[PDB]
Homo-oligomer: A and B are copies of this chain.
Amino acid sequence: MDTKLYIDGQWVNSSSGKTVDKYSPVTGQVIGRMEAATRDDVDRAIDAAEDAFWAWNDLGSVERSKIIYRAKELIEKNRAELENIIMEENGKPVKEAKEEVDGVIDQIQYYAEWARKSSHRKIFQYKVPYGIVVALTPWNFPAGMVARKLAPALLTGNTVVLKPSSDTPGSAEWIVRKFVEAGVPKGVLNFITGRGSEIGDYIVEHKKVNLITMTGSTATGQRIMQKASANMAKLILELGGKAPFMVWKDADMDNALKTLLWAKYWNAGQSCIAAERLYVHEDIYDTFMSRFVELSRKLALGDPKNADMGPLINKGALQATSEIVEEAKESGAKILFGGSQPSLSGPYRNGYFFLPTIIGNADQKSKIFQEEIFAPVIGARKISSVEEMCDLANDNKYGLASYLFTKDPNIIFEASERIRFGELYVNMPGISEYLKLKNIYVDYSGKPLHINTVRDDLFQS
C-alpha cells in the first residue's frame, strides 16, 4: 500500500515531493511507499493541532469517548485487514498478529471506559489536557503501541501529531483512517511519516509541542530528552531493556523452557521485555541447554500463515545481528545452535530471517551480555549461588523486566528486593500521565487580610 499524510483533515502528499520505499521483511522486496514529510509539513500539522485544540476540549469527555467507542467498533468490524497489514509489514506469525489486534481492541475499550471518571476559602482542582501531543510509535507492535498512545491522549482532550516508525507506517495509517471515520474532527489527529534523520529532531523540539509520548530504544529516548530541553515538553518514554532469565536448580523444567521460548522468540525477540541473558544453575545446566537447543531446532521460519517465528524488521537490523554474532565468535564464544540466516526456498531467502541462536562460553562483560540485542539470540552462563545470580542480574545499565524460575520461596522473597528491576516475572511469562492538574485558590471572606510580613500599621493611614 502507498501511505500518505493526514494534515488538518486532509490526506496529502509531502510538500517536497519525496517518498521512502517500504520493504517486506518476508521477501526483501519493496511492497509500498510512504510520504517523506518536510519540516514545513510538520509545522502545518502542529498548527492544525493547535487550531483544533480548544474545540476538542469543549466537546467534553463523553463525546470523545463516544467517538473512541465508534472507532473501536469499526476496527473490530475490519480487524482482518489490520491483521493482514501487520503480516505484510512485520512478517509476524498470524497468531501473533491476531493477538496484537485483540490487545489493541482491548486497550481502546479500556481507555474509552475512563470517560467521566479557612471556612471561606476553597481550592478547585481541574484536570486538563497538556495540549499538543506528539506520539512516536516503534514498530515492535506497530498497532498496539499506536492504540496505547492515541486513545488515552484523545480521551483526555489532547490533540495529536503521530509519527510512526519508518518501518511500519501502514498499520498506523489504517488506524488513523479508522479514527477519522469514527468522527475525529479536522486537526485533532494528524499523521506524519518520514525519516527521522531529516525531521525527527525537528518534530521533538518544536516551539508549540507540550507533551511527547514515545516507546523505542534507549539512545533514541536520550536524544529526545536532549532535544526537549528547548520546549520543556512533558516526556513519557518507555525504553526497553536487557532482561535476565534465571533458572534455579529446583525449577519445573518444562514450564521454564516454554517461558524461555516465549520470551526469546515471541516477535523474534523484538520486545521491551524479551529474554536477553540466560543464567542457569550448574546442577541442571547442561541438560537444560540441550533441551533448549532441541526446542529451537523445532521452530519453523518463513510464511506468517504457518511459521512459528517471523523475520527481523529490516536489512539493517539483520546486518547488526550478524555483526553481533561475528563479534561473539571472534572472541571465544561457542555457538551452540543457529548463528546465521536460515536456508529457505523461493522469495523467503531474501527476507530478513535469522535462526534461533544460542551461545555458550559467554562472557558476562561482553556485548552479548551488556548491550540490547532485540533479536532471536541469547547467551547462557552457569550460576552456583543466589547472591552471585543477583549480582549478575544487576550488572546492567538497563532495568526493566526480569524472569525467575524456582520453587524456593525464600529465594523468591529475596529477589523481590535484591533484583533491581521494574517487573519480575516469577514462574510465568498511565492515563493520568496525559492530564495536567491546575488549582484555583479562592478567598471569598470579603474581610481584611493579615499577612505576617506586611505591617498592618501601614493601613492605619
Write the residues of chain A forming the contact surface with B, with a CB cutoff of 8 angstroms.
Answer: 57, 93, 95-96, 99, 121, 124, 126, 128, 131, 218, 221-223, 225-226, 228-230, 232, 239, 252, 254-255, 258-259, 261-262, 265-266, 295, 298, 308, 407, 412, 415-417, 420-429, 436-444, 446, 448-449, 451-455, 458-459
Contact = CB atoms under 8 A, between A and B. Distances in A.
A427 B443 contact: yes
A262 B450 CA distance: 11
Contact of A426 (B259, B422, B442): B442
A426 to B, nearest CB: 4
The copy count of this chain in the complex is 2
B258 A454 contact: yes
Given A439-B422, A444-B427, A455-B308, A225 B229 contact: yes
Contacts of A259: 449, 451
Contacts of A439: 422-424
A308 B451 CA distance: 13
Contacts of A295: 458
B218 A222 contact: no
A438 B421 contact: yes
Contacts of A449: 255, 258-259, 428-429
Given A423-B441, A424-B439, A426-B442, A451 B228 contact: no
Given A426-B442, A442-B427, A459 B266 contact: no
Given A426-B442, A441-B425, A443-B426, A453 B225 contact: no
B424 A438 contact: yes
Nearest to A98: B452
A126 B422 contact: no
25 contacts: A57-B417, A93-B453, A96-B453, A121-B428, A254-B448, A254-B459, A255-B448, A258-B449, A258-B451, A258-B459, A262-B451, A266-B453, A298-B458, A308-B455, A412-B440, A412-B442, A415-B440, A416-B440, A423-B438, A423-B441, A426-B440, A428-B441, A428-B442, A428-B443, A429-B451
